[PDB]
Amino acid sequence: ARAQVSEAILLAEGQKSAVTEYYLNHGEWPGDNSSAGVATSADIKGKYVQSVTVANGVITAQMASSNVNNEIKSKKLSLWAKRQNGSVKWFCGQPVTRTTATATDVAAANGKTDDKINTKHLPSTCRDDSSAS
């Protein structure tokens, strides 16, 4: 499980440059994959990953539905960044959502627990809470 999740995190990290550069150039986060200049979400695939979706700067990877551990089939994790006075810090954990392109904070984006990869299956360094800062 964790081995599969760690490869999903690495794939999702491949979209960070598009998101960070957009923030650098616009002072706000990209609304979707197209505005970030990246491929459509279902075309960002890999080992164990069916899609990667950019939404207001949050990068959410969705695990594949087959050929993955039963307990993480089709579940999701997010990478997201927050301003910390000039620099930005990237976080990794359960799914989050940023409601607007300019919001500083994020909210948890659970799916009524359905989309959440269980914490036992997240690498120890990818357990950031939605409230992390």
Residue numbers in the entry: 29 to 161
Paper text:
In the bloodstream an unusually tight interaction between the bacteria and the brain microvasculature endothelial cells is established, leading to cortical plaque formation that results in opening of the blood brain barrier and bacterial invasion of the brain. The interaction with CD147 is responsible for bacterial adhesion and the interaction with the β2AR induces signalling in endothelial cells. N. meningitidis PilE (Nm PilE) is 78% identical to Ng PilE and 100% identical in α1. Here we report the 1.44 Å X-ray crystal structure of Nm PilE and a cryoEM reconstruction of the Nm pilus at higher resolution, ∼6 Å, than any T4P structure reported previously.
Nm ΔN-PilE is a globular protein with an N-terminal α-helix corresponding to α1C, the C-terminal half of α1, embedded in a four-stranded antiparallel β-sheet (β1 to β4, residues 77–121). Between α1C and the β-sheet is the αβ-loop (residues 54–76), an extended segment with a single-turn α-helix and a 310 helix that forms one edge of the globular domain. Two residues in the αβ-loop, Ser63 and Ser69, are post-translationally modified in the native PilE3940. Conserved disulfide-bonded cysteines at the end of β4 (Cys120) and close to the C terminus (Cys154) define the boundaries of the D-region containing the β-hairpin. The most protruding segment of the D-region, the β-hairpin loop and β6 plus the beginning of the loop that follows β6, is highly variable in sequence among N. meningitidis Type IV pilins and is referred to as the hypervariable region (residues ∼127 to 146). The β-hairpin loop hooks over the top of the β-sheet and across the β1–β2 loop; Ala129 at its apex forms a main chain hydrogen bond with Trp57 at the beginning of the αβ-loop. Not surprisingly, the Nm PilE structure is highly similar to Ng PilE, superimposing with a root mean square deviation of 3.1 Å for all main chain atoms. The only notable main chain deviations are in the position of the β3–β4 loop, which bends away from the β-strand in Nm PilE to a greater degree than it does in Ng PilE, and in the β-hairpin, which is more twisted in Nm PilE and has a two-residue insertion in its loop that allows it to contact the αβ-loop. Since the N-terminal 54 residues are identical in both proteins the missing 29 N-terminal residues in Nm ΔN-PilE monomer are also expected to be α-helical, forming a continuous α-helix with α1C, as seen in the full-length Ng PilE structure.
